[PDB]
Design a protein around this ligand. Structure first.
Ligand SMILES: NC(=O)c1ccc[n+]([C@@H]2O[C@H](COP(=O)([O-])OP(=O)(O)OC[C@H]3O[C@@H](n4cnc5c(N)ncnc54)[C@H](OP(=O)(O)O)[C@@H]3O)[C@@H](O)[C@H]2O)c1
Ligand SMILES: Nc1nc(=O)c2nc(CNc3ccc(C(=O)N[C@@H](CCC(=O)O)C(=O)O)cc3)cnc2[nH]1
Length: 206
């Protein structure tokens, strides 16, 4: 009703959990951002017909997206904003919280809609990530680990890859990362512009 479906978080972070610098992400990875795009927009061939995915983001991340690239295409965009100062858009929603956002979609994309909702992704930032991390429906984290201690001023709020969260969060086999993303993806380290990174999938039991 409020939330029927599971939520998925997607992030690119350093080994120190740094995610941004100056209202921007501190690196330029074309193949990396390409991955974000195919994950956040992939719906099965048959479900391909009606279905669109949803990306939920906090106000600042909204602003941090290149003007040329937003709203993020082929996805339903929703910005979480308490203030709701300006909630502009030609078909893009606003919502007071994560729960409010879930209910607006269920309401907007019910049976009286052509286009049905497939998967829901939280794309950040840190404040929205903190809220998702405490949501009873978030069970999966699509993370990109960047093996470089790049200077950041914003951090991922929970050390899910640390020993203290190891009985809760588990890293999945690559084979099931590829099955969930539905495309094959590069295994192990990837080098692009001097940075080494890797794709991972973590899951927790609800
Ligand atoms: N590396 C990555 O994968 C990645 C992914 C996303 C973001 N980032 C980076 O992280 C930074 C953006 O992060 P951020 O923490 O500063 O901001 P954020 O979460 O993007 O936006 C903060 C705004 O979002 C709203 N908000 C967030 N959670 C909310 C909740 N539970 N209830 C109500 N409103 C909520 C509030 O909006 P109002 O002020 O409108 O009320 C708050 O001011 C940028 O540097 C961005 O590049 C990196
Ligand atoms: N894995 C991952 N990498 C990221 O860079 C990332 N970034 C955010 C937040 N910031 C951003 C910034 C820009 C665009 C963006 O323009 N994406 C375009 C592709 C743009 C391009 O081809 O250069 C899109 O269409 O998704 C998305 C999210 C959230 N989760 C992430 N997750």
């Amino acid at each position: 009703m409020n939330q029927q479906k599971s939520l998925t978080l997607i992030v690119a972070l350093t080994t120190s959990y740094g995610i941004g610098r100056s209202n921007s992400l501190p690196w330029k990875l074309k193949k990396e951002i390409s991955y974000f795009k195919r994950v956040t927009s992939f719906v099965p061939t048959f479900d391909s017909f009606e279905s669109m995915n949803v990306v939920l983001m906090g106000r600042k991340t909204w602003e941090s997206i290149p003007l040329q690239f937003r709203p993020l295409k082929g996805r339903i965009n929703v910005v979480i904003t308490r203030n709701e100062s300006l909630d502009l858009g030609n078909g893009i929603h606003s919502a007071k919280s994560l729960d409010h956002a879930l209910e607006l979609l269920y309401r907007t994309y019910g049976s009286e809609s052509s286009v049905q909702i497939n998967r829901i992704f939280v794309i950040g930032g840190a404040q929205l990530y903190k809220a998702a991390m405490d949501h009873p429906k978030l069970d999966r984290i699509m993370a990109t680990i960047i093996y470089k201690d790049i200077h950041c001023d914003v951090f991922f709020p929970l050390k899910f890859r640390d020993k203290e969260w190891s009985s809760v969060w588990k890293k999945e086999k690559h084979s099931d990362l590829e099955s969930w993303v539905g495309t094959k993806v590069p295994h192990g380290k990837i080098n692009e512009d001097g940075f080494d990174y890797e794709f991972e999938m973590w899951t927790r039991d609800l």
